[PDB]
UniProtKB/TrEMBL annotation:
It is an enzyme of class 2 (transferase). The lineage of its organism: Eukaryota, Sar, Alveolata, Apicomplexa, Aconoidasida. It comes from Plasmodium vivax (strain Salvador I). This is phosphoethanolamine N-methyltransferase. InterPro entries: Methyltransf_25, SAM-dependent_MTases_sf. It holds the Pfam family Methyltransf_25.
Length: 263
């Protein structure tokens, strides 16, 4: 590992208990990333799997994606997340599902046998890894996939650094994200031998999601304050305000990546 993820920093900041619950409010139950179940439905709309398939979710969070994939396809699903408190919640909320497993571990410390998974799936999680660690992860993913297996990712991406301003640099620093442009990210995946690579800019869709997420939040302000704090309310509102502004100027981007292991 080049740059270990700062687990304690994450737990104390972006993924505080209060922060996680605030994300669930804005995205919907079981989700802490863009679009919640809405985006998940769209992202998986072309994917075909069955009850005998095996899927890895890298950065499984509270388990929404795993629940969805298992519900839609009946697949065996294995979610990995570095954050143990999340994994604990994911387990507690999915005790009914024999084909869903969650594991608390840094994905970079996981080893899976060659040809384990029909699909490797990751939603806004790889942004936590340094460039070198992204590359190491993609090389592992290539090994872990079955022949013809699919890698399917959404992730935050960015413009070149010379166009970053102080407020954007501050956000990146606060989040400990490592972002890069979409086509560079696609190139990294290609360099690991993946074929049929698609590296697509879905920022227009991202903006659609952000706008409705924010308007619903503001409509429900008084309700939010009954259960959660004004601090978390303003954190969400200001955070979405800046994401909307920064995607409109092409600074913060949403990338979609699909690739296939071909022998
Ligand atoms: C923005 S959340 C998204 C979670 C989930 N995919 C979702 O859509 O709700 C990013 C997740 O990546 C996880 N994560 C960060 N670094 C990781 C690593 N090295 N290995 C596994 N998970 C990691 C975090 O703990 C967090 O749950």
């Amino acid at each position: 590992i080049s740059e270990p993820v700062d687990i304690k920093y994450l737990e104390n900041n972006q993924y505080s208990d209060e922060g996680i619950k605030a994300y669930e409010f804005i995205f919907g139950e079981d989700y802490i990333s863009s679009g919640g179940i809405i985006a998940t439905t769209k992202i998986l709309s072309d994917i075909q799997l069955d009850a005998n398939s095996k899927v890895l979710d890298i950065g499984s969070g509270l388990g929404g994606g795993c629940k969805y994939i298992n519900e839609k396809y009946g697949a065996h699903v294995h979610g990995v997340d570095i954050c143990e408190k999340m994994v604990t919640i994911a387990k507690l909320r999915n005790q009914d599902k024999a084909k869903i497993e969650f594991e608390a571990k840094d994905i970079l410390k996981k080893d899976f046998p060659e040809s384990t998974f029909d699909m490797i799936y990751s939603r806004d999680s790889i942004l936590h890894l340094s460039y070198a660690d992204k590359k190491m992860l993609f090389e592992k993913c290539y090994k872990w996939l079955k022949p013809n297996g699919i890698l399917l990712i959404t992730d935050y991406c960015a413009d070149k650094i010379e166009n970053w301003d102080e407020e954007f640099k501050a956000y990146i620093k606060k989040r400990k994200y490592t972002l890069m442009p979409i086509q560079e990210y696609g190139d990294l995946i290609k360099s690991c031998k993946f074929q049929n690579v698609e590296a697509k800019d879905i920022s227009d869709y991202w903006l659609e999601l952000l706008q409705l997420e924010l308007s619903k939040l503001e409509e429900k302000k008084e309700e939010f304050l009954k259960v959660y704090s004004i601090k978390e309310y303003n954190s969400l509102k200001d955070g979405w305000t800046r994401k909307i502004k920064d995607t409109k100027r092409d600074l913060q981007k949403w990338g979609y990546f699909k690739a296939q292991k071909m022998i």
